[PDB]
Scaffold this active site. Sequence first.
Site, short mmCIF file in Angstrom:
data_model
loop_
_atom_site.label_atom_id
_atom_site.label_comp_id
_atom_site.label_asym_id
_atom_site.label_seq_id
_atom_site.Cartn_x
_atom_site.Cartn_y
_atom_site.Cartn_z
N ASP A 1 -50.57 -7.69 -29.24
CA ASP A 1 -51.93 -8.10 -29.57
C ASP A 1 -52.60 -6.98 -30.36
OD1 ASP A 1 -52.47 -6.20 -27.60
OD2 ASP A 1 -52.97 -7.69 -26.08
N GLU B 1 -54.65 -22.28 -31.02
CA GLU B 1 -54.39 -20.85 -31.10
C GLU B 1 -52.99 -20.50 -31.59
OE1 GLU B 1 -55.76 -18.26 -28.16
OE2 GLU B 1 -57.76 -19.15 -28.08
N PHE C 1 -60.97 -19.05 -23.51
CA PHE C 1 -59.86 -18.35 -24.14
C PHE C 1 -60.25 -17.72 -25.48
CE2 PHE C 1 -56.77 -20.84 -21.42
CZ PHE C 1 -56.28 -19.73 -20.77
#
Length: 410
Positions: free
Chosen positions: A130, A121, A214
């Site tokens: 985000d 990631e 995740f």
Amino acid sequence: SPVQYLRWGDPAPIAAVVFACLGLLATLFVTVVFIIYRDTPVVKSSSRELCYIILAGICLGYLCTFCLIAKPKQIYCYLQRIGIGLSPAMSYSALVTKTYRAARILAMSKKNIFEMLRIDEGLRLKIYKDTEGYYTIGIGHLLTKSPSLNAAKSELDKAIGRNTNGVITKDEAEKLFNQDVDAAVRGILRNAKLKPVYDSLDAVRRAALINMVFQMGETGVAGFTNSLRMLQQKRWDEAAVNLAKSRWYNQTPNRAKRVITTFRTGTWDAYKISACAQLVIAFILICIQLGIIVALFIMEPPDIMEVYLICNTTNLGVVAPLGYNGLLILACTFYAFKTRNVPANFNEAKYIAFTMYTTCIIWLAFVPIYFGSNYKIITMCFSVSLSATVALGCMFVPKVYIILAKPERN
Ligand SMILES: CCCCCCCC/C=C\CCCCCCCC(=O)O
Ligand SMILES: COc1cccc(C#Cc2cccc(C)n2)c1
């Protein structure tokens, strides 16, 4: 003679002696059971020599009552002080190194999953947002939810401990990540569809599942019904084939391959990614207590001042070894708490943590009770014995039970 005192109407001396005799028998039973069956899994991976130190300490603990309920000989005053200070130290010093190793092993597992996701990631060492606009740093760690940058920086500084200025290091990103993983495990264990697969998986394969969580969230992962089932039943190759058919695989193939391969091997091959030292350290933590005791022997020489043995031990002669043992207990509790959910060796850690919870309470309660007591010798006898019985009962009795009553499990 303790029988005399009972006759004379004082049952305390004989009660303490009986407690200590039973304590010695049980410790003797447990030790022999560990000698014979040392040849078995439930005992081998756990540290054997360290276990003996702990048992020896418990044994000496019970023996202490024979030092307190004694004939008036000089050496018993020496023995009292030696036994009362050194026997808890023997047990707790061997134990702290045990819980310490269990804490390092765990940490290095957290490090691996951190590296896995750094690769899959990525992380940012400087504050960002985000897709939803919320201030974030590292591997997607949410800092705050307000639309103020300075609030994020303060919250970051609060989380890290230095004045970061919106910039952290990789080790610090890991620190934040460890929290997010902890919370991630909570959610999985709160999910009926995901709990049984996670419980059944080894450590490495657990990370692979956490990796998926995740990426897609729990609700997404729970959508792999068949694959999760196969994984749960240990059909690794079949799970791999099945997962390679998914839209997940097709939308993000590069990452999915590494994750699927991790599921298939149980290794970290898709990502770049001392027992003797224990005894020496345990030896050192014990000699320190001996040093304290020997020093107090020179500052405040033991002396006698019937069945009860009154020695001239001052408050300092008690408190200094007591303080040191208190520190060992504290360190044990700290490390034991950290590793409380570690499944290894039939959830051995869950028992160790419970033991330290009890020890802390017992010892904290000892301070006001003992120093406000007019019956100190008997209070000491019961206290040492209770503490030794708590250790023996909560840690060793279950191991012995598994040994003798579940030979098809271990
Ligand atoms: C969970 C904590 C571990 C156990 C606590 C250890 C207790 C020993 C430490 C310090 C006790 C406090 C100092 C002794 C009070 C002196 C009483 C007095 O003499 O008047
Ligand atoms: C709580 O009141 C006290 C006060 C002083 C000492 C002690 C003690 C002890 C001990 C001995 C051997 C093994 C183990 C686990 N604990 C207890």
